[PDB]
Structures are given as structure tokens and as C-alpha cells.
Amino acid sequence: RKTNIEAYRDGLKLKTEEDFFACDRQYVCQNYAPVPVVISKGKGARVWDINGNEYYDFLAGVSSLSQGHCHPRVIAALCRQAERLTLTLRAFGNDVTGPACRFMAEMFGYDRVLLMNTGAEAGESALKIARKWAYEVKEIPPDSAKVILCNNNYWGRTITACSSSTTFDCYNNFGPFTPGFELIDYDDVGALEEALKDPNVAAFFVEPIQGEGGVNVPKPGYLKRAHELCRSKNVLLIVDEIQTGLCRTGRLLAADHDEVHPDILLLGKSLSAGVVPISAVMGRADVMDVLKPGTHGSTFGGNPLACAVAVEALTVLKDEKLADRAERLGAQFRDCLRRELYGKVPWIKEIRGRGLLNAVEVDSDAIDPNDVVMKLKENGILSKPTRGRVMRFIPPLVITDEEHRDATTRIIKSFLAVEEER
Amino acid sequence: ARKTNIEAYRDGLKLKTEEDFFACDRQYVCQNYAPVPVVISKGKGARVWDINGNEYYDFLAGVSSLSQGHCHPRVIAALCRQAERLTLTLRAFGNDVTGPACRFMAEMFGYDRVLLMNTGAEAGESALKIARKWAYEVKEIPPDSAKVILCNNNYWGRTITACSSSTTFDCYNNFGPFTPGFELIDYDDVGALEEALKDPNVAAFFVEPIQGEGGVNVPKPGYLKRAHELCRSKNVLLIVDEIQTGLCRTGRLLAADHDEVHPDILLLGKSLSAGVVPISAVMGRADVMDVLKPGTHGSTFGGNPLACAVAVEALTVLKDEKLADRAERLGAQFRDCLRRELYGKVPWIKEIRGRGLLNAVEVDSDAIDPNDVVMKLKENGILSKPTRGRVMRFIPPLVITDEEHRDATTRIIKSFLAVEEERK
Ligand SMILES: Cc1ncc(COP(=O)(O)O)c(C=O)c1O
Ligand SMILES: Cc1ncc(COP(=O)(O)O)c(C=O)c1O
Numbered sequence A: 001r002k003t004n005i006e007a008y009r010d011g012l013k014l015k016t017e018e019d020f021f022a023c024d025r026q027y028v029c030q031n032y033a034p035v036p037v038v039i040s041k042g043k044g045a046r047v048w049d050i051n052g053n054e055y056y057d058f059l060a061g062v063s064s065l066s067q068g069h070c071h072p073r074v075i076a077a078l079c080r081q082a083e084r085l086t087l088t089l090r091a092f093g094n095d096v097t098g099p100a101c102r103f104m105a106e107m108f109g110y111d112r113v114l115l116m117n118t119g120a121e122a123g124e125s126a127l128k129i130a131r132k133w134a135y136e137v138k139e140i141p142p143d144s145a146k147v148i149l150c151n152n153n154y155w156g157r158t159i160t161a162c163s164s165s166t167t168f169d170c171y172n173n174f175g176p177f178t179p180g181f182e183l184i185d186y187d188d189v190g191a192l193e194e195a196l197k198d199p200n201v202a203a204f205f206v207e208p209i210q211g212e213g214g215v216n217v218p219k220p221g222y223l224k225r226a227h228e229l230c231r232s233k234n235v236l237l238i239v240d241e242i243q244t245g246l247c248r249t250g251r252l253l254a255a256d257h258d259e260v261h262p263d264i265l266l267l268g269k270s271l272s273a274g275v276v277p278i279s280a281v282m283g284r285a286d287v288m289d290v291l292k293p294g295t296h297g298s299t300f301g302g303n304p305l306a307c308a309v310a311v312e313a314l315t316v317l318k319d320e321k322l323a324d325r326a327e328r329l330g331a332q333f334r335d336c337l338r339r340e341l342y343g344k345v346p347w348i349k350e351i352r353g354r355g356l357l358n359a360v361e362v363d364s365d366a367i368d369p370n371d372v373v374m375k376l377k378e379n380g381i382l383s384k385p386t387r388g389r390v391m392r393f394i395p396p397l398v399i400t401d402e403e404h405r406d407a408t409t410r411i412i413k414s415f416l417a418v419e420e421e422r
Numbered sequence B: 001a002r003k004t005n006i007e008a009y010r011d012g013l014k015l016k017t018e019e020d021f022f023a024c025d026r027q028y029v030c031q032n033y034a035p036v037p038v039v040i041s042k043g044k045g046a047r048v049w050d051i052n053g054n055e056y057y058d059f060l061a062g063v064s065s066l067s068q069g070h071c072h073p074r075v076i077a078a079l080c081r082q083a084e085r086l087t088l089t090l091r092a093f094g095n096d097v098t099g100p101a102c103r104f105m106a107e108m109f110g111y112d113r114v115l116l117m118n119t120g121a122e123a124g125e126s127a128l129k130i131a132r133k134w135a136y137e138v139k140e141i142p143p144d145s146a147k148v149i150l151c152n153n154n155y156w157g158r159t160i161t162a163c164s165s166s167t168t169f170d171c172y173n174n175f176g177p178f179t180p181g182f183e184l185i186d187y188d189d190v191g192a193l194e195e196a197l198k199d200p201n202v203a204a205f206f207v208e209p210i211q212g213e214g215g216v217n218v219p220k221p222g223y224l225k226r227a228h229e230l231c232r233s234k235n236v237l238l239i240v241d242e243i244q245t246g247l248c249r250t251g252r253l254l255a256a257d258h259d260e261v262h263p264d265i266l267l268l269g270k271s272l273s274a275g276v277v278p279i280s281a282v283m284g285r286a287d288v289m290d291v292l293k294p295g296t297h298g299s300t301f302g303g304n305p306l307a308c309a310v311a312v313e314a315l316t317v318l319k320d321e322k323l324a325d326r327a328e329r330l331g332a333q334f335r336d337c338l339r340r341e342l343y344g345k346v347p348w349i350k351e352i353r354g355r356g357l358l359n360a361v362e363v364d365s366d367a368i369d370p371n372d373v374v375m376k377l378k379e380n381g382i383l384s385k386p387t388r389g390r391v392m393r394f395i396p397p398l399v400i401t402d403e404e405h406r407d408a409t410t411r412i413i414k415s416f417l418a419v420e421e422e423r424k
Helices: A004-012 A017-027 A072-082 A097-108 A119-138 A189-195 A222-232 A254-258 A304-319 A322-341 A369-378 A401-421 B005-013 B018-028 B073-083 B098-109 B120-137 B190-196 B223-233 B255-259 B305-320 B323-342 B370-379 B402-423
Strands: A038-043 A046-049 A054-057 A112-116 A146-150 A181-184 A201-206 A236-240 A264-267 A279-283 A348-354 A357-362 A390-393 B039-044 B047-050 B055-058 B113-117 B147-151 B182-185 B202-207 B237-241 B265-268 B280-284 B349-355 B358-363 B391-394
Touching (some): A004 B073, A004 B305, A017 A038, A072 B005, A072 B073, A097 A279, A119 A146, A119 A264, A119 A279, A181 A189, A201 A222, A222 A254, A304 A322, A304 B005, A322 A401, A369 A390, A369 A401, B018 B039, B073 B305, B098 B113, B113 B120, B120 B147, B120 B202, B120 B265, B190 B202, B190 B223, B223 B237, B223 B255, B323 B358, B323 B402, B370 B391, B370 B402
Parallel strands (some): A146 A201, A236 A264, B147 B202, B202 B237, B237 B265
Antiparallel strands (some): A038 A046, A046 A054, A112 A279, A264 A279, A348 A357, A357 A390, B113 B280, B265 B280, B349 B358, B358 B391
């Protein structure tokens, strides 16, 4: 049986990529840039376009697809639960949400788990928790709570996220803005310490490696020291692991590189293996319990379908030893690129990353960075930069040794060819 | 059948009674919901079963997220077929589903452009961003001056900006400081709206056709029609939140259709996916929606192909099963019967109200404990969660059969009479 989207699409008689591009222009809100490919299918580290051409996916949902596209275990868990029960609301109990929260609480070492749907919602929820905790436990004056975050942070697209962004296109013309934020440079202990002098600070909200900001890896010991400074002042450390967590950087959490156990942890993206939107906020009881009944909610948060998917997605990370995989392959990737491209390619500014969260920043005054993106695609690598000039290499962690060797050589080949053509 | 992973996992926990699940929940789940009465394990159509095999009619239905019923076979089949092929690309890449699904929606609802988000709060956030950016760029109002009018007792979600525009104490208390830019007026009051619309800095009026969480507040006939005229007069966008009222619930495709109103910006959610996965939509004319240029808005999962395939199937069910007609017919019967068998007989009922299958019975909490009604309903096989304590809600799947609806209506009336007997 053809399902309705298949049948409706068939009737539209879309043959070429351009036909699909035209369909976007006409019917899809135009808040994304043009795209170079129309993907029809995904398996593991590979995707295929509508013409059957094969690519490696080196974006992977910006680390939402760590377990690969269409991981059979995760798709079986989705389908079996979907036949049984998908939604009760948290107004009613069910036989999945509590067990899934227990599973997560034990895996990550927290007392309480709040399940939301998107990463932005996890961030919003964490800010709300930190504010309410500041008022009720720290006893700071009404409406005075402040939250410190860093320049170039990214946590989503709500108005409060826009209000705390330093990125022009994220905030421009979307005000007036939510107050209560203090922005400081990333990777700067001094600036943090000075900001923490304000007793009305509730939290410091930080990424262990800035994602959208350009795969900005801080100096060794940054997060470790930040947590000490925060604790000195009774300020919560909220660590956004929505992009860096779940084995991507070679550890279960990127915070583990600094032996930091976040006061509040955010997860998202590969929590569901890219199958359905589910995010998490985790914290100790005496923080999370400020969210009393009626004070927060979500229709789909904690729905049993997403919970079943998430438990399976997390178990795959463990069973397939994906943190070890990411560590090993990522170190090989960076060594190969540094050996083969530094010196030879003068318009590479840096090769950086941890695990399989890697970037190559190029000098956009020396090269058109889009020429690198297009060359990569010609050689079978789909990759989307950030900030124009920061090339990103973020494959599924399940990429095989042989696929990763192939991909790495296609990657080298592409940078070298761009240099040759300069 | 062979055990599923999650079944085996929980089997390892030895959680067997409703009270073991209640304890599990108390210990590991963030405690932002009230205690629950029941542990549901299976849903099908208008029915659910608890872990002991007891059957109930679900009269909450996800607050109108399950209009197509639990586990609709077509929608599962669509989920599973698409899930085997592709679930997520990001909108950074194209795929062969998102554009077609947006065209499908654009044509069904009569809009130029469709923005797909994940939750109803995200749809609201997105619409407010669009309205503000449009007011700055097209209306040329002073920078940072954009205002949005909303109504007292509105509900649109739980983001900080939503909390900043709420009049409900537990929704906002101790979550500030708050996003500025909102003007709060009484619902169902055209004179208050007209006066608020005198301010040229207003970008939008954001309103529910029937207030949902605020208590199934049905406005006077012609409220929304008049509101639209007043907004147009002032070049103010009418943002209509159909997340709870839309998609056949009230006996029409959109609740706005009762007033022959085509929203300037439409919000959908909830039953857009038949309760299977979170997907929401913001739709609008080109000259409004096109302010959202590349890089100015985004979402990881928004527009993912899996959710798109599910939504197209869910929307088609509404049509094919003539669920607007079913809701209209059964809902009219429900209100007739309850009024006829409860008013007078039961002194502590204040009002029976609703449209289609979005119905409520507001009780006098000074004269009765509303929770006694909730518990009596469950004893009689009806799962129902009130809003604001005293507003009992009756929101079944629209696929409820004539026989199931008759049975349920008789159980509901029986429950209210029983509580009254006990009061006497
Ligand atoms: C670190 C981080 N936090 C939060 C978010 C927002 O997640 P979502 O797109 O699911 O709202 C993202 C998205 O890329 C992210 O990279
Ligand atoms: C009218 C209305 N709008 C928005 C929302 C928020 O949707 P969500 O819970 O998906 O964030 C709801 C939730 O019930 C609603 O009733």
C-alpha cells in the first residue's frame, strides 16, 4: 500500500532535483538557504539522492544521527511501540515514561529527568528551573535573576534564545527581548569570574565545545575551572550537551573530558537517533523539584513512543561502543588531515575538534569557502559549514573503519583540489 | 508476540502494580505534573487499557492530539514505512518529502507558505517572531516597539515568552524577568480589542477561537469575525491558534470556520500528527512569511521527513473519515443529552458548553469537590482531566463510534447523577 505522502508526491510528477527545489520556493517558508541535494534514503553513514547517487553524510543532523540513518534496532523499537501506545499526556500514567526516566537517571547519574521535545525547549526549561531555584532557594530579589552565557552560543530559536544570542541574524528584528542575560567571551575564565561577582546570577549556561559557533574547543581545564568558580558562588552550571553529548566527542558526555558532572544537563538530538524529537533536562532533586505541578508542561514531552525510541537509541550507543569508536576514528581523522593539509594548503586556518566533532576553518579572504563545500560534494561528501568559513565533519559514529578511511581520503582530495585550482 | 526491548527492560524492574509504576514515576520523573490515576499500557481508537486490562474511554485524547484515535492503522503504517527509509536530513539538505508535505498543507488550508516546527509552543514562538519582524520591516514601526495583543487566560505553551504573556499565576510565577511587548485584554470582548488596536505599534492579535486550557471558553457568535475586521482596519495581523480547536474538533476543519475567518497566520499542532510524533505548523501569506529569510529561524527536527509523512496521513484520515461531520453530530447530541439530564437535577453544574467534540461541564467547586466527579467518571470507565480544577473536560477521539459515544454519554451522565446522590 502506498501511503498518502507517496501517492500525493507521485501525483506532483516531480522528476528532477530542480522540480523539488521549485516546490520548496513555492510552498516551504524560506528560512533556510538553498540546498544542493535531494536525499531520498539513508542507511548508517550513507545517503542516496533521488537519482540514486551515494554520499557520506558528514552533517548527521549536526550530531542527531550518531547511530546512523535508520538504525534497525531503533526503527524496530519505534514500530513496536507505535502499534501499542504513542501518547497519554503526563496527565495520565503509562508503562513507559517512568521506566525510561529511570534508565536515563541511572545512565547519567541524576535524580530527576524532565523530558521535552526539542533542544530549544530543553534550554527554556533549564532556564526556568534555574530562575525559579534562584528565587526560592537562593532568595534573590524578585525578577532579578541573571544567567551568564557566552558570545556565539547557540541553544535554539525561541524569542528567549534570540534574546541571549550574539548572532545578528538570530536576533535582528525579533525584539523586544527577554532581559536577564550577561554575555561573556567563551573560553575565558577571567571574564566568567568577573561576571560571577553579581549575587543575582542563577546559572552559567555553556557548551563544552561551541557547536554552531564553529566547533570551538576551549583550552584544557576550562569547564573544570568554570564549575569551581560557579560553585564558589552557589551558581548552577548548566551544560548544554545537545550537540556534544552522547559519545560524539569520544566520551559519554563532553563534560567528562574535564570530569565535570553538570548541575543541570541538557540532552537532545541523538537521544532519539534522529527518529523523533525528544530532549532531556536532568538535575539533582533539590533543583529539579522546584518545578511543582502546574508550573511547567508540554503536550508531547515524555510521550511513550519517544521514550521507547530514546531507550533503544541510548542502548545502541553503549552496545556498539560508539564513544570508543568516535575517539579512535576522530584522532585518526585529525592526524590525517593535519599531516596532509597543513603547509600544503595555506588557507586552512585550523583543523580542530574532539572525537568525531571536527572542523576545518578556512580563511574566507583567501578562498571562497563554498568552493570547498561543492568539491566535497563532487567527491561524495555532504557537509554544511557554519559561519560560512567553518567546514564541519560530523559523520554518524557507526561509520565503519573502511567507510571512514574512504571518506577521509575523499575529504583530503577535496581540499587539495581546491588548492590546486587556486 | 515476542517481548519488545522496553517490555523486557521494565520486566527487569519487576514493576507490576499501578503503585510500582506510580513509585517509579515519583522517583525518577521531574515532578511537574499532578499524581495520576491510572497506568495506561495500550490504546486503540477511542479506548485505552490499563496494565490490568481494564478498559476506559479516553475523554482527554491528548487535549485533542488524538482525534484520529489511538494507534490509527493508517498513520502507524505511514510512520513505519517512512521510518525504514529516511527520518531526518535537516533543512540544510533537501529531501523528497518536506516540500510535498508543505504543498499538501498549503493547498488544504489555503496558504502560500508553510513553516513546520515540532511543538505548539514553537509554532507560537515562530508566529510571534514573524509578526514582529513583519511589523518592523513592512509596517515600519519604531525598533523594539512591536506589541502583540493576547487574551486573559490564554494558553500557548511553556516557553519563557509564553509565560511572559500568561495571566495564569503558576504559569509565570518566579520565571521572570519577562519578555516585554504584550498587551492582555479580556477574551470575548470586542470593545477591549478595539481600544487596544488604537496603538499603532501593535503587530498582531493572537487568539484562540475557543479558549482551551482556559476552560473551553466559547465566545459569543461573531467574535472572531468582528475581531478580524477590527484588525484589518489597523493593518494588524490576526494570528489564530488552532492547535487545540483545529482539525475537525469543533465540527469544522478549523474552528475559525464557524466565523468564516481565514486567519492571517494559522497555527496547527496536536492532531496534525494524530498524536504520533510532535509536529506543528505556522502558515501565512507570502508577503508575511517571507520576512523569515535564510538563517533567521531554524529547528533541528522541524520539517523532518518522518513527521511530514505522518502528518499527511493524519490529515487525510480527517478527511476520509468525515470527522468534522462526526464531531458536529455527536457533539450536538452530547450537549443536548447532558443539558437535558443534568441541568436542574444537579445544582452544582454551572454550565455545559462547547462546540463539536470540544465540550466542558464547569462545576461549582464551592458546592461540590470537583475531584469526586473525576473519580466517579473513572469508576464508570471514563478518563477525563479537568482544567482550572472545576472545568470538567470531555474531549474524546473524533473516531468514537455512535455506539461508543452513546455508551460513554450514558456513563458520564450516570457519574454526575451519582455524585449528586452522594451529596444528598
Ligand atoms: C548546542 C545546542 N543546543 C540547542 C540546540 C537547539 O536544538 P533544537 O534545534 O532541537 O531546538 C542546538 C541545535 O543545533 C544545539 O546545537
Ligand atoms: C491552544 C494551544 N496552543 C498551544 C499549545 C502548546 O502546545 P505544546 O504543548 O505542543 O507546546 C497548547 C497545548 O495544549 C494549546 O492548547
